[PDB]
Design a protein around this motif. Structure first.
Motif, PDB file in Angstrom:
ATOM      1  N   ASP A   1       0.786  -1.073  -0.092  1.00  0.00           N
ATOM      2  CA  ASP A   1       0.007   0.039  -0.063  1.00  0.00           C
ATOM      3  C   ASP A   1       0.914   1.277  -0.081  1.00  0.00           C
ATOM      4  OD1 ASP A   1      -2.470   1.637   0.033  1.00  0.00           O
ATOM      5  OD2 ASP A   1      -2.743   1.159   2.124  1.00  0.00           O
TER       6      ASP A   1
ATOM      7  N   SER B   1      -0.498   4.384   0.016  1.00  0.00           N
ATOM      8  CA  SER B   1      -1.444   5.412   0.289  1.00  0.00           C
ATOM      9  C   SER B   1      -0.740   6.319   1.530  1.00  0.00           C
ATOM     10  CB  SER B   1      -2.749   4.977   0.764  1.00  0.00           C
ATOM     11  OG  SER B   1      -3.242   4.438  -0.448  1.00  0.00           O
TER      12      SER B   1
ATOM     13  N   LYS C   1      -0.719   7.252   5.140  1.00  0.00           N
ATOM     14  CA  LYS C   1      -1.211   6.260   6.309  1.00  0.00           C
ATOM     15  C   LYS C   1      -1.471   7.468   7.509  1.00  0.00           C
ATOM     16  CE  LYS C   1       0.337   2.763   4.293  1.00  0.00           C
ATOM     17  NZ  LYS C   1       0.967   3.218   3.103  1.00  0.00           N
TER      18      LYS C   1
ATOM     19  N   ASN D   1       6.431   7.453   7.638  1.00  0.00           N
ATOM     20  CA  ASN D   1       6.382   5.980   7.028  1.00  0.00           C
ATOM     21  C   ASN D   1       6.681   5.881   5.629  1.00  0.00           C
ATOM     22  OD1 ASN D   1       3.993   6.848   6.322  1.00  0.00           O
ATOM     23  ND2 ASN D   1       2.957   5.959   8.103  1.00  0.00           N
TER      24      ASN D   1
ATOM     25  N   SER E   1       3.483  -4.173   5.002  1.00  0.00           N
ATOM     26  CA  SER E   1       3.151  -3.018   4.271  1.00  0.00           C
ATOM     27  C   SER E   1       2.115  -3.076   3.294  1.00  0.00           C
ATOM     28  CB  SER E   1       4.618  -2.792   3.315  1.00  0.00           C
ATOM     29  OG  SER E   1       5.555  -2.309   4.135  1.00  0.00           O
TER      30      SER E   1
ATOM     31  N   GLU F   1      -2.301  -3.229   2.465  1.00  0.00           N
ATOM     32  CA  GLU F   1      -3.403  -2.366   2.779  1.00  0.00           C
ATOM     33  C   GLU F   1      -3.834  -2.738   4.192  1.00  0.00           C
ATOM     34  OE1 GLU F   1      -6.350  -2.337   0.033  1.00  0.00           O
ATOM     35  OE2 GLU F   1      -7.601  -0.729   1.042  1.00  0.00           O
ATOM     36  N   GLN F   2      -3.929  -1.811   5.242  1.00  0.00           N
ATOM     37  CA  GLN F   2      -4.253  -1.998   6.553  1.00  0.00           C
ATOM     38  C   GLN F   2      -5.528  -1.336   6.667  1.00  0.00           C
ATOM     39  OE1 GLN F   2      -2.473  -4.214   8.649  1.00  0.00           O
ATOM     40  NE2 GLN F   2      -1.354  -4.709   6.755  1.00  0.00           N
TER      41      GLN F   2
ATOM     42  N   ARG G   1      -5.880   2.601   7.396  1.00  0.00           N
ATOM     43  CA  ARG G   1      -4.261   3.138   6.908  1.00  0.00           C
ATOM     44  C   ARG G   1      -3.304   3.231   8.103  1.00  0.00           C
ATOM     45  NH1 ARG G   1      -6.417   1.764   2.797  1.00  0.00           N
ATOM     46  NH2 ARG G   1      -6.361   2.884   0.815  1.00  0.00           N
ATOM     47  N   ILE G   2      -3.504   2.170   9.017  1.00  0.00           N
ATOM     48  CA  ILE G   2      -2.703   2.116  10.214  1.00  0.00           C
ATOM     49  C   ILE G   2      -1.206   1.552   9.861  1.00  0.00           C
ATOM     50  CG2 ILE G   2      -2.257   1.183  12.249  1.00  0.00           C
ATOM     51  CD1 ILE G   2      -5.148   0.876  12.612  1.00  0.00           C
ATOM     52  N   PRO G   3      -0.187   2.297   9.869  1.00  0.00           N
ATOM     53  CA  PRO G   3       1.331   1.763   9.395  1.00  0.00           C
ATOM     54  C   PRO G   3       1.851   0.801  10.394  1.00  0.00           C
ATOM     55  CG  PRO G   3       1.589   3.761  10.400  1.00  0.00           C
ATOM     56  CD  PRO G   3      -0.036   3.876  10.370  1.00  0.00           C
TER      57      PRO G   3
ATOM     58  N   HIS H   1       7.029  -0.117   8.421  1.00  0.00           N
ATOM     59  CA  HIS H   1       6.528  -0.161   7.130  1.00  0.00           C
ATOM     60  C   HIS H   1       7.446   0.340   5.834  1.00  0.00           C
ATOM     61  CE1 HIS H   1       3.475   0.436   4.044  1.00  0.00           C
ATOM     62  NE2 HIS H   1       3.870   1.325   3.860  1.00  0.00           N
TER      63      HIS H   1
END
Ligand SMILES: CCCCCCCCCCCCCCCCCC(=O)OC[C@H](COP(=O)([O-])OCC(O)COP(=O)([O-])OC[C@@H](COC(=O)CCCCCCCCCCCCCCCCC)OC(=O)CCCCCCCCCCCCCCCCC)OC(=O)CCCCCCCCCCCCCCCCC
Ligand SMILES: CCCCCCCCCCCCCCCCCC(=O)OC[C@H](COP(=O)([O-])OCC(O)COP(=O)([O-])OC[C@@H](COC(=O)CCCCCCCCCCCCCCCCC)OC(=O)CCCCCCCCCCCCCCCCC)OC(=O)CCCCCCCCCCCCCCCCC
Ligand SMILES: CCCCCCCCCCCCCCCCCC(=O)OC[C@H](COP(=O)([O-])OCC(O)COP(=O)([O-])OC[C@@H](COC(=O)CCCCCCCCCCCCCCCCC)OC(=O)CCCCCCCCCCCCCCCCC)OC(=O)CCCCCCCCCCCCCCCCC
Ligand SMILES: CCCCCCCCCCCCCCCCCC(=O)OC[C@H](COP(=O)([O-])OCC(O)COP(=O)([O-])OC[C@@H](COC(=O)CCCCCCCCCCCCCCCCC)OC(=O)CCCCCCCCCCCCCCCCC)OC(=O)CCCCCCCCCCCCCCCCC
Ligand SMILES: CCCCCCCCCCCCCCCCCC(=O)OC[C@H](COP(=O)(O)OCCN)OC(=O)CCCCCCCCCCCCCCCCC
Ligand SMILES: CCCCCCCCCCCCCCCCCC(=O)OC[C@H](COP(=O)(O)OCCN)OC(=O)CCCCCCCCCCCCCCCCC
Ligand SMILES: CCCCCCCCCCCCCCCCCC(=O)OC[C@H](COP(=O)(O)OCCN)OC(=O)CCCCCCCCCCCCCCCCC
Ligand SMILES: CCCCCCCCCCCCCCCCCC(=O)OC[C@H](COP(=O)(O)OCCN)OC(=O)CCCCCCCCCCCCCCCCC
Lengths: 459, 50, 63, 98, 55, 140, 120, 52, 347
Positions: free
Chosen positions: C54, C56, C58, C63, H21, H23-24, H27-29, H33
């Motif tokens: 991902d 996007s 975050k 990060n 890494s 898609e959570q 959008r929690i990293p 990450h």
């Protein structure tokens, strides 16, 4: 080679679609036609081998072995049809199928251009032979015999497989025609020492080497008659053929790796021939005589001269015919007295004179009477071993004394003296039996007229 | 045929012989090309062997 | 067979079998090099597909 | 690595050696097996919570559920063993030596 | 002495007796789950400490 | 126990006899402890004293085999002045086989273990010389 | 070995590049051998159910032959495809790594010294 | 036999939980990450032997 | 058992193995093994006698222990890699634990001690499932993790399985223990070639599954679980003795049969990697397997043991058992060696 492979396979529907009274006649007829056809393999050249395809070739080594192999099948059918007369019809057809399958494996064992296909046909011969011995052998010991025959072979031949695959990884090919031109010298090392043993010990078991020979006086003795005929006449010669092919790759290490085995053969032919002087079982005596005769072929292949290879292939063909005839003669007495004890039925020349003449001729060829091809092979090996070392004539000549002594003793015990009084079932010789003896002995004597076709690739 | 079983092994010879000849045409890359036997073709000849 | 036929058939057999032998030796050397270096089409053991990442923004920036 | 992981791994190895050294009862073996599961749960959970790896937070639950279903199956086998010999002794389960 | 006894003794008979004896040692297990898992523990300890299959 | 074999094979043949004997004794003792561990595992002894007696018996048997092997191999390498020679390990393996027959109190086991362990030790020496691999790394 | 080659397009029995290859003939001797194996399976199927072996259930014998020929044709297509892929990868790797595959200087046997070992 | 049914059918059965890494939710990293993204984008496609 | 429930449970065994074969996440591998064990426990307790309960308990304990070791290996991999992809492992301790766990699931020696007991305790059809279908999932996991498998461990397991499975079958008269020790030796042959060429691993697996399914189908078709009941087969169904003869000679790896095909190719792949001693000793050790196969061929096909009088009643009744794929399996287990280069379809 496919003009021989396909008729040999067509013998299978020929035996399985035959009428029940016709299964010996039809297979005998068409196997004799295949054997007549086998003489087209005598298109041999002074320089090149007869190279049919990528898979098959035939030089002057494989050609007499092929002709003898294809000749032995009708004679095995004639030898086996009497004692399998009361057999179930499907088991009778399965017996004939095992003989046909063994011929099929043998004819492409000897013509296999590539050595791993030689290995697969060479080991494929085990399965019909094992089945014939353990299923149609007469006694209990056949089962134990079938184990020894199976496990002296594979314990020798599974290191060969690895060795051959190593050559496949090193040379890039196991084509014998390619290996004639790409052979590299094999130097002295421990790696090449066990390379030599892995290349040689399977064929040493097949010959048999003395000390490794113990499977043979069980396997040839406990077998039925066709089993003993193909074991003595053909399957021992897989070892000699395989040595003559494989020792191309083993030079110059053979020049000292042969020294123990030569000793084991030169003394071994003194031992096993002497063993024949005290054998009470006639079929065991013929088996030990086969060990003694193949000891000369081992010595001749290991000293690797032209005279020794010519003598060894002549002696292989001659021993095939002679030992097969001797087993058939011993079987003709076994099918009357139902015992293989040699001292039991005596004085048989008074009762069976023409069969006694066959005993005489087979004994004379066993002791290598000139000018038989037995003597041609014997003598040429003796010439080459005298050139190898002059002292060998002692162990050679003494062998020819003992070989005479057990050959005539066998002839004196069974044929001469007074007949046994209480044995009264000695039937006159059937036309099938005298025919079987003549189909061994007449080609054997006719080969003395023209022995150059059995002298191998370096005639 | 009343004796149809006696042609299994003979025809299996002939067919086998046939396949051997049929294999020779697949191994004819050096036909009339060896240094020993290369030659000019005779009239009304297309191959030196078959 | 004629000696010419057997001779030239033997030459065709020898050419085919020598070419197969050279290709087997080259195949062994190619397998050795591709296992050692990993730069060929063989011995390509999987790694993680980067299309699973991902990219996007975050919840936290760093990060 | 971090100090709690030593003890959770040591708990796994202690319950492993308990499950690999039977005394008599099959139930004690099943208790050591579920102790192994409990330590795997704790170790997975501490990793996943430390890493802030969000989607793997549902992983230990799954690890719990399957293994407790496994435990249920084990108890049923024990009961059938205990419906044969009266006890759950492992030395009664020796008919298959011959 | 040779071809009924000693050439029979050194290659086939001693090999056959050896494989029989190894066969009877391998198949003399008492059917106990306890002993098999104790052997598994000894296997893991030899693999880790004595053979270093984890390094 | 891979370092036991390394501290055996690091010393040249016929140079330091006591440490070669001790290294082969330690290799034999480790093999005897492994055999004793599986022996008291799969076959329960009747007591703890019987178990430690079996363990000490198997460990001392295999350690005496290793000791007499390494001693005989190094002495035969000294008195013949041929360190890179598998006949030395043939003699050493036959000495270890006679040791295994003396521990089992039988002559036939002694001669059989002489022949097979001597040929095995000869093969191990040849494999150390020509670089034979038993656990060969994948290369192709 | 070639498992990363067929991993960008997985689970394809015959990929689209396999259609660049000539298919096996219907008179392929391997395919005739597979048909023979179907005929042998039909005979064993009559034998174990104690039917007359050559005569009973000719429809079943023919479906044995047909099903083995049908499966074996595609198996031979995949076999020939995989050996073609093997050679394509080999030749592309040799062409892309000339430093690993130099042209060896071939010497005639007038310069090549070989040691002679007499057999005497 | 890793039969890659998920890539063959285009279904995502388990790729979503496979890496940190990915898609959570919300959008929690993950805490690593950036490092995992760098290691995955480095090692992508070059095979494991070159990635070591 | 209800036939619908049997179908759902067998589909669940298949689903667990398929989930192992298709998943990219380690948790789903572990779930596939859990699902497979849970579904295969009723197949072993199909006939409800104390030997089946003992076999199912021993199977449960070994497979549950292996499953916990597998999950610990997965968790250590997650420590040292932060991810769950079914690929190489990123720690040698996790690689050792997963190799041990998969060897326990396969029943490779010295974790072999459950395989003859559990195979003897259960019916022939469920032992057919245990020796063929249950090898498929751990071999696929071993296939995918071979860049991290320690060589000395996997070859130690391989030779120890081949030797112990060879000597174990020599002492047996029960057919299920013979097939179990034969299984142990053949899995040793599969793992020995794994790090060198896993295509030959798949070849040995497929030929083993065909030959083992053939032998179990013959045993089910003749209702024989002992050597001495198999020796009555000639007086009841003489074709079955020929089929067990050719299949047992094939399982011994005798050419020209199909079971010569794996080991030859395995030696062909082990000598390219300069391992010469190891396939040599492996092939010589397989002669033990051939010896007890030959024992069974002597008792069944090559001799005629004495029968009983009541056998004459069974002459009047035909085999109504569905001998599913038995002629096809018998042909494929014997006559496949001329098609040896078909193995490239496994690449
Ligand atoms: C270097 C260190 C590391 C090396 C490697 C590991 C060390 C061991 C060698 C290899 C393994 C061999 C077997 C070990 C276990 C023993 C077997 C056993 O259980 O016996 C009890 C039992 C026997 O008892 P029994 O049936 O009651 O009969 C006994 C009689 O009552 C009465 O019998 P008894 O009183 O006459 O004595 C019985 C016993 C006693 O044995 C002895 O006394 C002999 C001990 C060894 C003597 C030789 C030592 C030589 C040392 C080498 C030379 C030194 C110098 C070297 C220099 C460099 C090289 C030149 O003998 C046996 O049990 C023989 C059968 C087993 C074969 C042993 C082979 C040893 C090879 C050594 C090579 C080194 O057998 C069983 O229970 C059999 C079933 C076991 C199945 C599972 C076995 C698994 C073994 C795995 C080991 C490796 C771990 C793998 C981990 C990685 C994979 C996950
Ligand atoms: C291995 C070396 C032999 C050691 C084991 C001997 C047999 C087991 C035993 O001790 O039984 C006693 C004992 C109870 O047995 P038993 O009641 O005495 O049974 C025998 C009867 O008493 C029968 O009476 P006996 O005791 O007087 O006769 C026993 C007979 C002794 O034989 C005789 O008494 C007459 C024959 C003379 C000796 C044999 C000569 C063989 C020569 C080699 C073959 C010819 C080659 C020619 C080459 C020429 C160019 C060089 O020995 C044998 O049967 C064993 C033969 C060798 C065993 C290994 C064969 C493996 C073949 C693999 C393919 C090659 O067994 C146990 O309690 C089991 C565990 C024993 C202790 C552990 C075993 C020692 C392990 C040391 C490390 C070895 C590493 C592996 C090296 C070789 C493989 C790579
Ligand atoms: C072909 C080969 C496979 C045949 C399988 C079925 C055999 C059978 O049942 O035959 C019975 C049948 C005659 O029996 P029946 O009178 O109708 O009824 C049964 C009796 O009542 C039987 O009486 P019974 O059962 O009451 O008692 C006697 C007892 C007798 O049994 C005993 O007493 C016990 C056993 C005695 C000792 C064991 C002997 C050896 C047997 C095994 C073979 C080992 C060597 C094979 C290779 C070495 C590796 C192992 O059992 C039998 O004889 C049962 C019948 C089976 C005999 C033959 C067995 C062959 C199957 C196994 C070999 C072939 C497959 C594996 C090959 C392996 C690699 C090459 O035989 C035939 O019909 C033979 C075929 C003849 C026509 C062939 C035409 C070929 C046309 C080809 C072109 C068309 C297709 C084109 C395809 C391509 C399209 C593109
Ligand atoms: C691709 C891999 C394929 C693997 C095999 C899949 C099928 C077998 C497994 C399941 C099973 O047992 O099904 C029953 C099975 C018969 O097995 P069975 O009970 O042991 O056979 C005894 C008698 O055949 C039963 O006789 P019956 O009187 O009860 O009925 C006669 C029956 C009646 O047939 C029908 O009713 C069929 C018509 C309905 C079909 C469905 C319509 C919807 O005829 C047959 O089934 C003739 C035998 C057909 C051949 C069986 C083996 C198939 C070939 C396997 C692959 C061989 C590859 C060799 C490669 C060698 C080199 C590596 O198959 C069928 O009934 C239909 C076979 C159709 C084969 C199609 C092949 C191409 C597919 C694309
Ligand atoms: C019983 C039944 C009948 C018999 C059946 C067949 C069995 C015997 C088969 C093998 C025959 C004996 C082995 C072959 C001997 C050939 C010559 C040879 O090796 O000489 C002995 C060797 C001489 O040493 P050297 O020539 O220097 O070797 C170093 C090479 N770079 O001497 C030495 O180096 C000392 C000895 C070392 C140990 C050798 C062990 C392996 C060989 C035997 C197996
Ligand atoms: C050297 C010292 C070795 C000490 C451990 C082995 C001693 C042994 O066998 O002890 C016996 C014990 C079983 O206990 P036991 O008292 O016999 O049970 C009856 C109930 N009173 O047996 C056991 O507990 C079996 C497991 C013991 C540990 C095996 C591995 C270590 C010892 C051998 C290698 C060193
Ligand atoms: C019948 C049985 C035949 C067995 C034949 C075995 C042939 C020897 C193979 C193992 C061997 O000794 O290899 C030599 C090797 C030393 O050579 P090298 O590769 O340089 O090792 C140094 C590592 N950095 O040494 C090593 O790799 C380590 C030593 C291996 C010794 C094996 C035997 C140990 C004792 C029994 C267990
Ligand atoms: C029997 C034949 C049935 C074939 C049905 C179709 C199967 C299919 O399409 O399989 C695809 C597969 C190739 O897929 P791939 O991703 O390369 O597999 C890697 C596995 N190690 O193809 C194959 O695996 C084909 C070979 C399978 C042969 C199995 C029986 C022999």
């Amino acid at each position: 080679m496919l003009k021989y492979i396909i008729p040999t396979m067509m013998l299978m529907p020929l035996t399985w679609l035959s009428k029940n009274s016709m299964i010996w006649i039809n297979t005998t007829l068409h196997s004799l036609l295949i054997s007549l056809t086998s003489l087209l393999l005598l298109n041999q050249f002074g320089d090149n081998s007869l190279n049919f395809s990528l898979t098959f070739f035939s030089d002057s080594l494989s050609t007499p072995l092929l002709i003898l192999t294809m000749w032995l099948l009708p004679l095995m059918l004639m030898a086996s049809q009497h004692h399998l007369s009361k057999e179930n019809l499907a088991r009778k057809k399965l017996f004939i199928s095992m003989l046909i399958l063994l011929q099929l494996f043998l004819i492409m064992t000897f013509t296999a251009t590539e050595l791993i296909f030689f290995y697969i046909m060479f080991e494929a011969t085990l399965v019909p032979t094992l089945i014939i011995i353990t299923r149609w052998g007469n006694q209990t010991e056949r089962l134990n015999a079938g184990l020894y025959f199976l496990f002296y072979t594979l314990a020798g031949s599974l290191p060969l497989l690895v060795a051959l695959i190593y050559i496949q990884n090193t040379m890039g090919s196991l084509n014998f025609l390619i290996l004639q031109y790409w052979v590299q010298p094999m130097p002295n090392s421990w790696s090449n020492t066990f390379m030599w043993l892995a290349c040689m010990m399977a064929f040493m078991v097949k010959m048999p080497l003395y000390g490794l020979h113990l499977w043979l006086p069980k396997a040839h003795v406990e077998a039925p008659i066709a089993g003993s005929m193909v074991l003595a006449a053909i399957l021992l010669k897989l070892g000699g053929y395989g040595m003559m092919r494989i020792t191309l790759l083993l030079n110059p290490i053979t020049d000292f790796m042969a020294y123990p085995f030569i000793m084991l053969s030169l003394w071994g032919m003194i031992m096993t021939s002497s063993i024949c002087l005290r054998q009470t079982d006639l079929k065991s005596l013929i088996a030990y005589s086969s060990v003694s005769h193949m000891a000369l072929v081992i010595v001749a292949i290991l000293i690797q001269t032209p005279w020794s290879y010519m003598g060894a292939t002549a002696l292989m063909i001659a021993h095939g015919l002679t030992s097969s005839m001797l087993f058939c003669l011993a079987n003709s007495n076994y099918e009357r007295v139902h015992s293989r004890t040699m001292i039991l039925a005596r004085g048989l020349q008074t009762l069976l004179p023409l069969m006694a003449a066959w005993w005489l001729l087979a004994s004379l060829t066993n002791l290598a009477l000139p000018p038989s091809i037995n003597l041609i092979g014997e003598l040429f090996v003796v010439m080459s071993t005298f050139s190898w070392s002059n002292i060998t004539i002692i162990l050679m000549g003494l062998n020819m004394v003992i070989t005479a002594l057990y050959s005539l003793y066998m002839l004196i015990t069974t044929q001469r003296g007074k007949h046994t009084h209480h044995i009264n079932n000695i039937l006159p010789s059937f036309t099938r039996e005298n025919a079987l003896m003549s189909l061994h002995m007449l080609p054997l004597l006719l080969l003395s007229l023209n022995p150059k076709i059995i002298l191998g690739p370096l005639y | 045929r009343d004796h149809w079983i006696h042609v299994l092994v003979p025809v299996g010879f002939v067919f086998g012989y046939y396949l051997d000849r049929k294999n020779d045409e697949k191994l004819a890359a050096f036909r009339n090309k060896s240094l020993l036997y290369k030659r000019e073709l005779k009239p009304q000849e297309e191959v030196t062997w078959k | 067979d004629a000696p010419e036929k057997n001779y030239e058939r033997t030459m065709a057999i020898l050419q085919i079998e020598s070419e197969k032998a050279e290709l087997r030796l080259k195949e062994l050397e190619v397998r050795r090099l591709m296992r050692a270096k990993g730069d060929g089409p063989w011995f390509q053991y999987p790694t993680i597909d980067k299309a699973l990442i991902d990219h996007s923004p975050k919840a936290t920036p760093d990060n | 690595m971090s100090l709690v992981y030593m003890n959770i791994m040591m708990a796994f190895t202690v319950s492993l050696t308990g499950l690999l050294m039977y005394r008599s009862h099959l139930m004690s073996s099943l208790l050591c097996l579920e102790g192994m599961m409990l330590s795997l749960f704790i170790l997975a959970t501490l990793m996943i919570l430390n890493s802030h790896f969000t989607l793997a937070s549902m992983m230990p639950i799954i690890l719990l559920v399957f293994a407790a279903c496994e435990a249920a199956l084990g108890l049923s086998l024990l009961v059938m063993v205990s419906n044969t010999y009266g006890t759950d002794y492992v030395q009664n389960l020796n008919l298959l030596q011959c | 002495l040779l071809d009924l006894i000693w050439l029979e003794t050194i290659l086939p008979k001693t090999i056959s007796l050896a494989q029989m004896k190894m066969s009877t040692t391998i198949t003399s297990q008492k059917g106990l789950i306890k002993l098999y898992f104790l052997s598994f523990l000894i296997t893991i300890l030899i693999s880790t400490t004595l053979l270093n299959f984890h390094e | 126990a891979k370092t036991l074999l390394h501290q055996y094979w690091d010393i040249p043949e016929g140079t330091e006899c006591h440490r070669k004997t001790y290294a082969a004794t330690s290799i034999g003792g480790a093999s005897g402890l492994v055999v004793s561990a599986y022996s008291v595992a799969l076959k329960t002894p009747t007591s703890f004293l019987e178990g430690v007696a079996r363990t000490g018996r198997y460990t001392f048997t295999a350690a005496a085999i290793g000791a007499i092997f390494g001693l005989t191999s190094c002495i035969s390498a000294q008195v013949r002045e041929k360190p890179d020679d598998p006949l030395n390990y043939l003699i050493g393996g036959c000495a270890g086989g006679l040791t295994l027959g003396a521990r089992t109190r039988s002559y036939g086991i002694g001669a059989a273990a002489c022949a097979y362990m001597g040929l095995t030790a000869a093969l191990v020496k040849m494999g150390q010389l020509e670089g034979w691999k038993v656990f060969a790394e994948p290369k192709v | 070995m070639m498992t990363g080659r067929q991993a960008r397009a997985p689970l394809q029995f015959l990929p689209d590049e396999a259609r660049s290859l000539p298919p096996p003939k219907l008179t392929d001797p391997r395919l005739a051998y597979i048909g023979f194996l179907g005929y042998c399976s039909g005979l064993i199927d009559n034998a174990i159910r104690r039917r007359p072996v050559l005569s009973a259930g000719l429809h079943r014998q023919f479906l044995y032959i047909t099903s083995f020929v049908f499966v074996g044709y595609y198996l031979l297509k995949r076999q020939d495809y995989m050996y073609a892929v093997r050679d394509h990868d080999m030749f592309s790797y040799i062409k892309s790594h000339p430093e690993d595959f130099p042209e060896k200087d071939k010497k005639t046997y007038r310069e090549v010294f070989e040691e002679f070992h007499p057999v005497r | 036999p890793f039969f890659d049914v998920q890539k063959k059918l285009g279904v995502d059965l388990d790729h979503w939980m496979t890496i940190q890494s990915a898609e959570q939710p919300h959008r929690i990293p993950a805490r690593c990450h950036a490092f995992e993204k760098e290691w995955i984008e480095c090692a992508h496609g070059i095979g494991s032997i070159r990635a070591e | 058992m209800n036939p619908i429930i049997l179908i759902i449970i067998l589909m669940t065994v298949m689903l667990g193995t398929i989930i192992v074969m298709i998943s990219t996440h380690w948790l789903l591998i572990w779930i596939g093994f859990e699902m497979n064990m849970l579904a295969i426990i009723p197949i072993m307790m199909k006939k409800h006698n104390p030997r089946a309960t003992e076999a199912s308990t021993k199977y449960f304990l070994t497979q549950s222990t292996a499953s916990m070791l597998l999950m610990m290996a997965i968790i250590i991999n997650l420590m040292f890699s932060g991810q769950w992809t079914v690929m190489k492992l990123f720690n040698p301790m996790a690689s050792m634990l997963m190799t041990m766990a998969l060897a326990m699931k396969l029943g490779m020696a010295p974790f072999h001690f459950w395989v003859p007991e559990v195979t003897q305790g259960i019916p022939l059809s469920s032992g057919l499932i245990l020796l063929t279908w249950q090898k498929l999932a751990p071999m696929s996991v071993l296939y995918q993790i071979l860049p991290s498998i320690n060589l000395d461990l996997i070859l130690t397991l391989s030779i120890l399985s081949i030797t112990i499975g060879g000597w174990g079958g020599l002492n047996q008269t029960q057919l299920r223990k013979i097939m179990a020790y034969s299984s142990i030796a053949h899995m040793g042959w599969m793992t020995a070639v794994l790090l060198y060429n896993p295509t030959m691993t798949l070849l040995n697996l497929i030929i083993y599954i065909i030959m083992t399914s053939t032998m179990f189908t013959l045993f089910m078709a003749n209702s024989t679980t002992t050597t001495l009941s198999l020796s009555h087969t000639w007086n009841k169904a003489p074709i079955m003795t020929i089929l067990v003869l050719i299949t047992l000679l094939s399982m011994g790896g005798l050419p020209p049969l199909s079971g010569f095909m794996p080991k030859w190719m395995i030696i062909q792949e082990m000598t390219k990697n300069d391992s010469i001693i190891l396939p040599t000793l492996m092939a010589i050790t397989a002669l033990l397997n051939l010896y007890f196969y030959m024992r069974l061929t002597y008792s069944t096909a090559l001799t005629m043991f004495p029968s009983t009088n009541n056998m004459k009643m069974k002459w009047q009744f035909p085999t109504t058992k569905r001998m599913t794929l038995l002629p096809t399996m018998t042909v494929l287990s014997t006559m496949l060696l001329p098609l040896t280069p078909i193995l490239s379809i496994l690449e």
